[PDB]
Scaffold this active site. Structure first.
Site, PDB file in Angstrom:
ATOM      1  N   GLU A  11      19.337   1.436  10.543  1.00 17.55           N
ATOM      2  CA  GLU A  11      20.550   1.209   9.776  1.00 17.55           C
ATOM      3  C   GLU A  11      20.846   2.197   8.660  1.00 17.55           C
ATOM      4  OE1 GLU A  11      22.625  -0.918  10.593  1.00 17.55           O
ATOM      5  OE2 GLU A  11      21.549  -2.330  11.954  1.00 17.55           O
ATOM      6  N   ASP A  20      30.997   0.684   9.392  1.00 15.35           N
ATOM      7  CA  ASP A  20      29.980   0.817  10.408  1.00 15.35           C
ATOM      8  C   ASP A  20      30.497   1.516  11.688  1.00 15.35           C
ATOM      9  OD1 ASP A  20      31.035  -1.216  11.769  1.00 15.35           O
ATOM     10  OD2 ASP A  20      29.363  -2.565  11.621  1.00 15.35           O
TER      11      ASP A  20
END
Ligand SMILES: [Cl-]
Ligand SMILES: [Cl-]
Length: 163
Positions: A11, A20
């Site tokens: 991440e 994202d």
């Protein structure tokens, strides 16, 4: 290597609100804020509520880590409460449990629960077949590098993909 280190690699860490891979507003270590297109209110609003202070879309490292701890905890607990996920988790070794937690963290308990076929193969310890099945998904097509890492983890039961 452990779950936290694994997810930290997958991440990354961002201290400012970001979008994202799916264009959603996120912050820290993969913490989704909102799926809504509104930044200036919606996302910042969610952020302030998550942190407990007026943030102005920026958090500290400690703040990011605090969200990350909560999210890993939630993921594990979600797996354990899920009728479909629990039995798979219980059947696996420590490394593979970590791969399942990763998928859950990224996609949600509901999302993982839908890989019915893969789940059954993981439970049966049919490693190579589960890997093949896991790859036939939007998940693999959209985030192939990360997906390959998780898949190798399930295949091998080792942390090689991350080393
Ligand atoms: Cl939260
Ligand atoms: Cl990727």
């Amino acid at each position: 290597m452990n779950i936290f280190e694994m997810l930290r690699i997958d991440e990354g860490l961002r201290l400012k609100i970001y979008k994202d891979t799916e264009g959603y507003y996120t912050i820290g270590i993969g913490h989704l804020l909102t799926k809504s297109p509104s930044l200036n209110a919606a996302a910042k609003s969610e952020l302030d509520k998550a942190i407990g202070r007026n943030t102005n879309g920026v958090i500290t490292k400690d703040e990011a880590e605090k969200l990350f701890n909560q999210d890993v905890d939630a993921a594990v607990r979600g797996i354990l409460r899920n009728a479909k996920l629990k039995p798979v988790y219980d059947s696996l070794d420590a490394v593979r449990r970590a791969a399942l937690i990763n998928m859950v963290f990224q996609m949600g308990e509901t999302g993982v629960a839908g890989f019915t076929n893969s789940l059954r193969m993981l439970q049966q310890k049919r490693w190579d077949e589960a890997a093949v099945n896991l790859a036939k998904s939007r998940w693999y097509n959209q985030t192939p590098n990360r997906a390959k890492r998780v898949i190798t983890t399930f295949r091998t039961g080792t942390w090689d993909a991350y080393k």
